[PDB]
Amino acid sequence: LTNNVAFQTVKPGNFNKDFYDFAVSKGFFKEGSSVELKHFFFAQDGNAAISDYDYYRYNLPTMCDIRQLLFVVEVVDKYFDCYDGGCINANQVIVNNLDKSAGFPFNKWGKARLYYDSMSYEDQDALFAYTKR
Site of interaction with Zn ion (CB under 5 A): 87
64 annotated binding-site participant: no
Q: Which does 87 bind (CB under 5 to 8 A by kind): Zn ion, other proteins, none?
A: Zn ion
Q: Is 33 helix (H, G, I), strand (E, B) or coil?
A: coil
Helix, strand, coil percentages for the chain (3-state, nearest 5): 35, 5, 60
Q: In the complex, what is the shortest distance from the CB of residue 91 to other proteins, in angstroms, rounded to a whole number?
A: 17
46 interacts with other proteins by CB under 8 A: yes
Q: Which does 15 bind (CB under 5 to 8 A by kind): Zn ion, other proteins, none?
A: other proteins
Q: Which does 7 bind (CB under 5 to 8 A by kind): other proteins, Zn ion, none?
A: other proteins
12 interacts with other proteins by CB under 8 A: yes
- Judged by CB under 8 A, the residue of 71, 117, 121, 126 near other proteins is 117
For the chain, list the strands marked E by DSSP: none
Find the length of the chain: 133
Q: Is 44 helix (H, G, I), strand (E, B) or coil?
A: strand
Closest CA relative to residue 111, chosen from 121, 122, 100? 100
User: 91: Cβ–Cβ under 8 A, 6 or more apart, which residues?
Assistant: 121
Pair 48, 9: CB distance under 8 Å: yes
132 interacts with other proteins by CB under 8 A: no
Give the interface with other proteins as residue ranges (CB under 8 A).
3-5, 7, 9, 11-15, 17, 20, 29, 31, 36-37, 40-47, 105, 108-110, 114-115, 117-118
Return binding residues for Zn(2+): 87
